[PDB]
Amino acid sequence: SGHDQSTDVFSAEGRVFQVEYAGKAVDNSSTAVAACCKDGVVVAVEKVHTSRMLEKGSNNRIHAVDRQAGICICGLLPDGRAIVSRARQEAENSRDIFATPIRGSVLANRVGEFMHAYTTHFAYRPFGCSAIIASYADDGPQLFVSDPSGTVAGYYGVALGKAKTVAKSELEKLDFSSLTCDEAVGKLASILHEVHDKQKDKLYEVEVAWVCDKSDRKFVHVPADMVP
Amino acid sequence: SYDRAITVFSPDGHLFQVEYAQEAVKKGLAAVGVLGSDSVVIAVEKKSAVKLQDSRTIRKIYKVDANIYLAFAGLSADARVLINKAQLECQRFSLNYEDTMDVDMLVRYVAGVQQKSTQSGGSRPFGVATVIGGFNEDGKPHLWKTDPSGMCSAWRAVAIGRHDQTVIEYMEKSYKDGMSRDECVHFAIKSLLEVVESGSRNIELLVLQYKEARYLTEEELQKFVVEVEKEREEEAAAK
Amino acid sequence: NEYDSDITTWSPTGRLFQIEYANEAVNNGSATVGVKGKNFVVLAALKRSPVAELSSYQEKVFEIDEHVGMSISGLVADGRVLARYLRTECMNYRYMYSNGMPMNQMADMIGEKHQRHIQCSGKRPFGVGLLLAGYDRQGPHLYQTVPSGDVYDYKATAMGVRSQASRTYLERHFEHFSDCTLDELVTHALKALASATSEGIELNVKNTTIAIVGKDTPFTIFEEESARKYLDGFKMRP
Amino acid sequence: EAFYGLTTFSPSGKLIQIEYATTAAGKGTTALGVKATDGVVIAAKKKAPSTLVDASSIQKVFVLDEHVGCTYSGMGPDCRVLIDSARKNCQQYKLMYNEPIPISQLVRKISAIYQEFTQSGGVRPFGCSLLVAGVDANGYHLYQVDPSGTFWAWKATAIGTGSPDAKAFLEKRYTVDMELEDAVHTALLTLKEGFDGQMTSENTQVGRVVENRFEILSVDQLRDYLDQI
Amino acid sequence: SIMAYSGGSVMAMAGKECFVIISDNRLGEQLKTISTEVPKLHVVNDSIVYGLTGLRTDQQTFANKVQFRTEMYKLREERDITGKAFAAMITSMLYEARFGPWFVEPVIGSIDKSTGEVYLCATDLIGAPCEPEDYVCAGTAAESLHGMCEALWRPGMSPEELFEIAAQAMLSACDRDSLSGYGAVAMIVTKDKVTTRLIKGRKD
Amino acid sequence: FDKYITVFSPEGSLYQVEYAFKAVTYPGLLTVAIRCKDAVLVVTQHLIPDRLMRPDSVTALYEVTPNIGCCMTGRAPDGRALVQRAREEASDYQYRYGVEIPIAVLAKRMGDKAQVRTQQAGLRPMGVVSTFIGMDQSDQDGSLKPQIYTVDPAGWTGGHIACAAGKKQVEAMAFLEKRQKSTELDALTQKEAAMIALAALQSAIGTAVKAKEVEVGRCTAANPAFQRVPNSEVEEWLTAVAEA
Amino acid sequence: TTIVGVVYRDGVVLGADTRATEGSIVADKRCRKIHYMAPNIMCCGAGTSADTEAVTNMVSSHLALHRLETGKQSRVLEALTLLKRHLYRYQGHVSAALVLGGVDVEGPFLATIAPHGSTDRLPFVTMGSGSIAAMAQLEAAYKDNMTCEEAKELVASAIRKGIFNDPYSGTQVDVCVITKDKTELTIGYDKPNERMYPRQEVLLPPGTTPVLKEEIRQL
Amino acid sequence: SHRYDSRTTTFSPEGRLYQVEYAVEAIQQAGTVIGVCTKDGVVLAGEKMVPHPLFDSESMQDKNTSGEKMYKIAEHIGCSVAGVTSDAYALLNYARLSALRHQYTFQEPMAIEDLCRILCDEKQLYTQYGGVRPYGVSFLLVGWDRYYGYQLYSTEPSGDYSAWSAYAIGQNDQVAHALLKKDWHESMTLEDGMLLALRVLGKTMDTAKIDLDRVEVAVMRKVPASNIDQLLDPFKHHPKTTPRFQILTRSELKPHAERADQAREAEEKAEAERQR
User: Fold this and answer.
1) Are D175 and D186 spatial neighbours (Cβ–Cβ below 8 Å)?
2) Nearest 5°: CA angle at A141, between A135 and A144?
3) Any idea which fold C1-238 has?
4) Looking at the domain that runs over D1-229, which CATH code has it been given?
5) B positions 4-43 inside 8 Å of D (CB)
6) What residue of F is the nearest CA neighbor of G106?
């Protein structure tokens, strides 16, 4: 019973149940999908709306961390926003202190270090979100995923959330050497429309963002015309 | 530092840690205060004359300032810390306002310290009830009680410690408003004798008058205890 | 349940129960309603209805700056704590920039502040829901803040006890709110709120606050003489 | 951020977490010390998990200062805390008094740190016994400090696994006459009793206090002594 | 000067298996003399005697701080502190106050009870030790004492000889100083015995 | 109660430390370091099951300083965390003393960090075996000599001739120990030593490895900087292993 | 003070006068200004004696503690960096001017640390009041790859310049030879100022000085 | 982490501090110490741990400041401890500092009751604040001051202290208190209190003769003051007699121990004649 109450405690098997349980919060969350191309990177996230009466752009899961970089949050949105707020703090320390856009690989490691910190101490809990860091700084288009554990990994393509498995099947059909950001916006949104449960989650939209040559290596929401 | 919450509410609205600090006071040696016309008398029971405890006189009624004395019931150690705190406050008060601090003022300070201990994270309450007597500079006599909750009340006569409620129920039957220095001393001993062992040696008692604190000698005292124990024989014959 | 005691404990199913429970504080709070039109936001809150000839007042609606205010449901103590924070942050903003804190930026600040409370052991989630209502350059905004730290940009919403009835009413009509006047919005806010009332009790000045904010209208709370213009000549008919 | 004490009294009056740490200290490899008229020798066996460990990188005997050194039993990493602090204390003492710290005063300062960790909040006790051996104005010294904070001056003792048999063996062999070259012989003979497999300069470390200095025997110096036993 | 305010001079002198430490007796406030019976010597133990010159407040405060440290040492260490350690301890104490110093200039005489080897150590107010073979001094008459001690002092002097030249030095130097005199208390430390002598000087 | 905080069990053991050692094995990756006459190698299993994961990104090997490389085995993010501590510790040392931190000092300082988390309640041990490799300047002649220092979750720091950490470390050691009776192992060429390390990897996991499925760190007397060995040079070693 | 260092072929020679002064007065004729830092590192000190003593002791202690951690002979760069960082922190209020000589595995290393915590790593250095006089001898007579004897003689010559031509420098030349293997500290390598006129023993027989009171205590 | 808090500084339902009650039970496991306060001085006699033949002396220069059982706190204050020796050492150092901090401020020796009070205020703290165990140590403080003369104080882990004519802490404290109650009188020479302390020590640890190897004795007494140094402070009054804490050697204790042997022997000849 006491093996899993806090994240400061390994189990006998050698694992940190509170971090696994935080992971479960992401796997029960709305599906997010992303693709790293030559042209840049694209993030599409399904937002499950609880109500018919929300404004367009309510509970935005995708947030600019810097000009060149954006975090899409799959999981508990509020927790996600604490990571966004930190990723921002790190992005602005890179420009304030080192006069450089933070590199994607760096920004990701910094996001993972932060998320991991919360897995080590009895007083805190793990974050309930996987951050998807999309960046196009001097290290090129980079797509990373920090999970609740703090584990960062680079991806060509990546699916998170309750349709993770099926959305990944569809991401494997894409050739990543070939595809452009303009195709990806189409295919990633198409994937999220396909994998979505129509009977369970009636009200939803697909928030897409990118950072590509097209967008001036600036991390922005894609216009509503490309999205379908 | 360690600021875990120790004194907390339970489902029935009780602060268990304060109720248990009062359980520590009930186990404590009986003390008694009696207010007269011109006198305050505080009488306490001692653990009883063991041949080994130093013949040199140790007083179980502590002096907070010239004007103010207190007996306590409960944990000796905790009481010594309160008394040292009260002692310091009285001197902090003479420093900050030329005046000597009134009894009622100090009682409220001591009761405040006891309350803080029931709401400070990291601390248990003081396991101490207090009987504080004395005279304000004006000449009015004051007798107060402070319980571990930090709640303080003034009394005409009071008891703390073991069988406090037996002594108080006994006192409020026999207590008369205007009393002589001798009648107060008589009444205090008579009252303590309700719960304390028949022995005269255990009782030690202090008589406060305006600018005059005197402890009864064990010669002065055994006259009163003989006179009282012959009156407790008179009351045993009646019933 | 061995997982519902501390805020720092995930359940094995990936739920934070202390947050689900803080949410129950909001749902047992007295009903408030928010509707936004083209140029205006209308908060309408049920107060407690006077028992015989005996009144209670409890400040549930708060001006936060010229251009913003709040309607709370749940632990009124925690409402006051957010009210003070938002007032302090709006003053700071207005001090620096000589203009009202934009509402999108304010929504992000409350979200953030809630989140500080849902992760540390020492802290606890705010047991209060807000309806932020504000007006800036981007026009009128209605946010519903929630203990979880989520912040919902809403066209219309309700909060508190029997508010599923209010949200049902609002869902029939909310599409027509950008076309409505100020007087039709306030009718709609009240008509929604009156769905949330118990059994037989009607809306009136003594049991209903109304607050408005919008284009050229600073955040105003109408009680008594001011509210009567909307509430004397108001009845709820099916 | 945990400030509550981990070491508390049992109803019987024992400090259970100090008894358990003393178990941790008994579980290390055998180390031992022998005071002589003209010096002291402390010897520990540094049995390496595998032959792939760089034996020279294992350190079972430590210099604390020119004139005092220690060995230990139990949790290596815990000892490294005590040894680092003891080294600080020898230097702090030199800075103040321009004099080597007496072993008396060093051992007392180590004892104090053991005791902090038996009482201070949010920490468990050290799971290691020290043998401290040095030389001051008062002569040659061998102390054992324990997880409790308790310390004993010994003529000869052992800590770690075979320590009840290695103490028994030292009690017979030890004499007050015993000189340093005879004590080093005796120390290594005591290790050899509990030992499984041959002893080597890679397998055992040996500190000795001689004249006014503590030194760790080089593998060449240790081979000269291992040829004779 | 804050150092010359209280007046007083102290001098120590090394002989064969002995030293003499000698303070004047005056306490002042600039030119007004408060007392003529304030020797500046302190006995740490059998083997160590020190003087403090400088601002009397600090002589008294510093002397207390040292008495604390030496008594604590005696309890902890279970032995008398040695002259070297005592001196080293006193530099540590003075340098703890480098920026905001104690207005004292300690003169330390010591003797190793076994070896018989004498250790003198004067110190400036921030702990800079001066550890010569011959003699050390400090205080208002220090310029004049250096002259007297340089002239009269020889290496291998017996205690009795050493006392005479230390007394004649302290007296003659104090006769040319407004802020020091009213005789002297000298203290002749050997391995075997400690003589203390009040010396008749001027009333001036 | 013994098992969830950092307190001794009745048998004098720290269960949370014994469990952080289990965290090292849990990910199922094995590392092997080996020290030759003029070089240190560290070989880490580098498995990316996902075809969509960018191989370049997931690294067990980190540079701590130009001259000290590291290989972390266990919770990746705990590994990443200790690297940041090591880098802090090295940076701080270079500033305080004006010279690069010696690998044996760094290792020891990381052991001290680990020990703290075993003695203070509420801090989780980093469930990772840190394997520092690097040259160390001999003060006798100035010659660089190769060093492996492991730090485990207990705080236990050790120099090694060869070491394994991870899934089948007991089986990889068994292989290296059997190969240490034949050869000197410190008289070996970088090529010969690399083959032994890669062969221990291959023996322990029970399968032939591709050059893609391992990442290899390196410090030599000639080039003391911690380099990632390119896939080409590892391919030559695996063909050299599969032949002999 | 005049303190001097030269790099020779096998190591470093440090050099120092011996005169300590309280103002215009010689407090100690034979005081030692060449301080042990480590087995292979010595450190001559000028400026405030208290500060030179404290900073040099503090570092030597830290180096010693660090030598137990590393198991490795202390590098003169480690010593140099500890002194620099300390002295810099205190903005020259710790007024220790130092000549740090040593021989680590990187070879002979001689440097000054100025009180503000500047360093100059040079083949010959001088600090103190007699620095300029000493440096004149060094600039005039230093060559690369001097023998130990050439270097000791040059350092003594340099110190003598301070002794004779600076009033704060005096008495004798202490020389220290740090080589790769060992550190030979020669006190009074050169004693140019022996005794002019043998001391006239003024005889004051016991009972010369009048004594009011006397307490004898036996031990 | 709050889950694993032992809650040391809390009341139990009966109004008792369990951690203190249990610390007391840890002192009843410790070596017996007897205090006897006379008019000539105080005597501590303590039960040392059975001496292993490999136990060495720390060859300390001053023999009278520490033993196994007895510690000098200041020139005029000594003590014995029963309980956690490592806690004792912590608190002994605190006492030493407090007595010297008093001497710093007032330039007079600290009153015994004042030290006892400071030492016990420190122990009380750990029963109220800070969520850590109490000090599992009881002191016998002995000492002389000008106020009350020769004094003996017991000190309890709770913080409460008490003055005693004679007392005992450690293993058979109750059996000792009985044997001190019987044989202690107000008019007692130091020799006569030394005798009592050793007879009660001898009888508690159930030995035929007093085992010199297993007992330590300390004596707080006033001796003639020698090192006056009157000329260095002419106005300072030096008392004729100064208190001196002394820990008896084996040779110094042997006649006092042979006299407690002979008194046990003569009392056993009386027990033979009572039966007759």
Assistant:
1) no
2) 60
3) Glutamine Phosphoribosylpyrophosphate, subunit 1, domain 1 (3.60.20)
4) 3.60.20.10
5) 4
6) F142
